[PDB]
Amino acid sequence: ARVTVQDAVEKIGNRFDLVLVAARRARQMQVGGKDPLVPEENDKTTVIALREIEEGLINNQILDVRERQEQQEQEAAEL
Amino acid sequence: KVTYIIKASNDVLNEKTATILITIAKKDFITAAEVREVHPDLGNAVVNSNIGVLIKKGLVEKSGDGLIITGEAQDIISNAATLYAQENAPELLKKRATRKAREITSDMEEDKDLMLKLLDKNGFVLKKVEIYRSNYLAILEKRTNGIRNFEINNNGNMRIFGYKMMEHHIQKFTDIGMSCKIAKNGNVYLDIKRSAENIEAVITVASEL
Amino acid sequence: HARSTGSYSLVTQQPLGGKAQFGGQRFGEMEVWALEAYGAAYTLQEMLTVKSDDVNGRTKMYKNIVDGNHQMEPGMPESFNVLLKEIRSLGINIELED
Amino acid sequence: EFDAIKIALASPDMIRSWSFGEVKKPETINYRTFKPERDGLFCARIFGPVKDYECLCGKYKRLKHRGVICEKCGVEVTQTKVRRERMGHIELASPTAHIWFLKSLPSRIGLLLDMPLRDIERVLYFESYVVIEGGM
Amino acid sequence: KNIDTVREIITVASILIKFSREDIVENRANFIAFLNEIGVTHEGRKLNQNSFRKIVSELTQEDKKTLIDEFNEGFEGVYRYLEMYTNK
Amino acid sequence: GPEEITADIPNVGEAALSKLDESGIVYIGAEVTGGDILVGKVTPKGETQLTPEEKLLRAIFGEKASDVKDSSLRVPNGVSGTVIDVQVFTRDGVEKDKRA
Amino acid sequence: VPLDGGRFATSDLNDLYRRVINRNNRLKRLLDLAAPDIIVRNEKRMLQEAVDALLDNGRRGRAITGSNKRPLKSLADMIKGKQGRFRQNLLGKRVDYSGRSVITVGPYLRLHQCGLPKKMALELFKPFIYGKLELRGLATTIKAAKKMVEREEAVVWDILDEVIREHPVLLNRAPTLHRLGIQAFEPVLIEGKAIQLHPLVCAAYNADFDGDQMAVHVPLTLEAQLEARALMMSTNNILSPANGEPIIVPS
Amino acid sequence: EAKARRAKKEMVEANLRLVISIAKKYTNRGLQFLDLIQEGNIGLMKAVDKFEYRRGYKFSTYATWWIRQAITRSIADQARTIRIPVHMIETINKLNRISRQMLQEMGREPTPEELAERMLMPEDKIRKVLKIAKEPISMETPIGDDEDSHLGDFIEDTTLELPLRAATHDVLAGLTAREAKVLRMRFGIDMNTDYTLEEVGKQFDVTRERIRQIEAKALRKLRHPSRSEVLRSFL
Amino acid sequence: PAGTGYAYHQDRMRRR
Ligand SMILES: [Mg+2]
Ligand SMILES: [Zn+2]
């Protein structure tokens, strides 16, 4: 599960923005009713978000793309 | 019908807003589209004109979409059903038998005779003697020994009631076996059976307080 | 000795000190130096504002944290408002700007 | 929400604008009851209601009458936090030197007036008098 | 049974004192007039004071526990604040 | 008014009250745990600003409020032991209970 | 504030204001009676003395005392020193969700986890287990859940086996010299009343096991959990910040 | 006028030393020096205001009464943290006299009953006077063994009970869905969608004036002693 | 403005 966060620094090389990306993502998974991408092993949203960072399919850019797309579905599906 | 409405409103209305007023008071907070639905004879701005009269009179008003009368128009409706009961349902406006309730026994009369005999005897003057709830009240003049009145209930119990009586007086009346009920402000009840020997006993303990 | 949420002081809205009085732990300012030695921005924020001083912040924190939420609403420490009034109470006008 | 702190001296009209009244009397509490007094160091009609939406005399505890002053004593029934930010004042009948501008070392009044602090102390403590605009 | 009628009584009371309109609960006859005009009904009729004290009286302790537990559900934000300062 | 050392105390279970006597003081020898009650003390208090539970319970149910709240000497939390003796001191001119 | 008993508790500053407006009123009255100049002169002297005593009791040659032969505290010494507002109230505070105890060893642990006593973990995580008992619906109102955690049912221990599953805590020793004195750990619940601690850390805290007491703290918000797990976690800090030498040297 | 006033100035300047000489009797009584001195100056002012030289008396005797008047009045009204009135201060001083002689004459100690025989007051007032004979505590007093902690560190708050967008949002959160069920099955008001919060707040305003409206209908039926069967004849 | 707050003050300082 989670012993180190080294891979998150390997795929995002700043280590101070990781709390922002994983905070935004895990806030999108706990309060916002949306599913993760890595399958669940009955863990808190912290390990889920950081493990999505380890998979390299979540960063700041892709979250910007999908939130962009969500409000695009708001104003586009508003009619 | 609307005779009682327009008559009860002192002719401030016509028959259109009379039956519309029956509709508004008939179901609470109904839509005006239902009013125009149950009034197909009236136009849309005719119904809206009549609601302009009731809003103009302030009787029927909105609650958002709501439409209901106020209490004064409610009194007009209840007077309308009142006169409708006077002229249309006469025996519905009736009344059945009414309880008095309680009537003074002659034993209570004779025990009042010996009561006034022994209070008039022992120099204890009276404020007033009253038949109240059909019960006697040998009320003391002042609040003497923390006592207010020497009363008789018709339920076979003569009672001594007071305000901040001392404990030793209460002990003197539990010598002759009387119940007590203190209150949260000092009001004290003293129950004994209404009998001539209890008249002599209560007035002879009260005569030595 | 342990404490979730106990009694609070009177002049400054802070927890008490000790065990007999059901008190909290002093988080001294050398430990604050230890936190900003790290890049710990948020932990230092909530450990002097939400968990200590802002009454509205700690009520909203408690309600959100029993509602499954984890989110803070920091505002302002009340002790700074006390110091504001107290050095305001001399002939020294200080203010808050736009 | 807010940027930088602004800091200045206190104008007298500024600190009249801070206050919500003038304390007058040095007495504190009722003794028999523990109510505060009329215009002492603890007050309702200066500083606010001492109790939870409860008046000084006690008529307008009503929630319909909440927010209005009473008639026996005139107490605006409001929250209890309000007694942590309403400052007051007191009109000194004589001028008075602030101590921080007189003995800060260096004295601000001192080098502002180009005058030794022994001398200004002699002016303050009424034992040596000074001249204002002798002219000719 | 009558327990459901009592459920609407306390629920209307919950809305009633929730929306800052208090004085109409503590007085009783006007309160029963309010309940009769809004149209609650036990056994095909309106509500009498004798009938009110019967239906409050004829009642089971566990059902009373159920009613106050259901009543406390709307007033949760008050009670969390109420007990957060009493965790001694 | 003053305080009382009565045994009656609102809003508690009879399991707590089983350890007391009829006066409000535990018997000499009761094994106690943390959270139990030793001396039942009440404090009279009006103007309570009552909470919605007793708004409902006072209003709908025929029920008066409580002019008084708990101040009983409880066990400090965590400890457990045995009450081995109890002393009573009374101000002079005050009527005593049975236990003193 | 009236405290326990008849005793009242005041600040001396109340007395200090009382002196100055007392003296002010007497100066007003002495000007009203048209006194000679010695009287009003010394009256203005004492008013100046009272004002400057109120702003700084002690910059005068003799600081005045009110009672108990000990100088009272003016507005100046409410701020300065260690006992002022700055170094006591705003820069270092007393904080909820915390605790302390005595430490011990337990060498069966991996170094990213520490032992923790179960009565503390039941104490410091009351809002979490209240929220989970509301979530699973085993309780319905809040006070029912309070009665379930004081009544000590057997189901709650599972619940604080999920809320302490990946929720780190912070550990502290009071003389915090350098920044390896605040470290984060995943907890493991154990018995007893002491905090177990990994043996490769007793050099980092400068901790000997002769009875030292450590304080524990809880990160509440989510960003604090990420700051704890990314930066405060014990595996991330094996090298000193003073040099490249490791701190995890076996002692 | 000015002539008489400067004469009075000369007398006051003559008698300042008398004020200092009598001033030593009340030093550690809760005041300072200059309080007592300036109060004594007031006592000289009212003393010279009412002096008669024709009595053949030296001024000190007529002065001393007014000086003790001003001083005793002054400590009476200013000394304590709370200004208690003067006559129970006199009563307290009687109980300190009687406490002294009844103490060392009885040897052991005074009981309040012995004060209830030496003073004729009914001993319920005695324990009240004994209750109010106390003075408060400074919070900055150190704790025992001089540990750096004060009384203000320990006294706690008590008043911690029973306290717009989130205000309306909590009311929607306050409904446990039975409430809105009887708000639309009885009051017609609908919580259906995630509206504008202004539609929420205006909707709740319609609720408040709604129940006020049904209230205004509700109280008015307490007039006519009739049964509902004639009332439902028009329904 | 050191850890996360340095990015935060880049943001807020950038907005002004
Ligand atoms: Mg050691
Ligand atoms: Zn008022």
Residue numbers in the entry:
A (entry chain E): 2 to 80
B (entry chain M): 3 to 211
C (entry chain C): 1244 to 1341
D (entry chain D): 16 to 151
E (entry chain I): 3 to 90
F (entry chain C): 846 to 945
G (entry chain D): 253 to 503
H (entry chain F): 369 to 531, 540 to 611
Copy out sentences from the published article reporting this entry, exactly as the authors wrote them.
Transcription of T4 middle genes proceeds by activation of T4 middle promoters through a process called σ appropriation, which requires the concerted effort of two T4-encoded transcription factors: AsiA and MotA. In this process, the co-activator AisA binds to and remodels σR4, which then allows the activator MotA to interact with σR4, as well. In addition, the conformational change of σR4 prevents its normal contact with the promoter -35 element, so the transcription of host genes is inhibited. Here, we report a single-particle cryo-electron microscopy (cryo-EM) structure of an intact σ appropriation complex, comprising AsiA, MotA, Escherichia coli RNA polymerase (RNAP), σ70 and a T4 middle promoter.
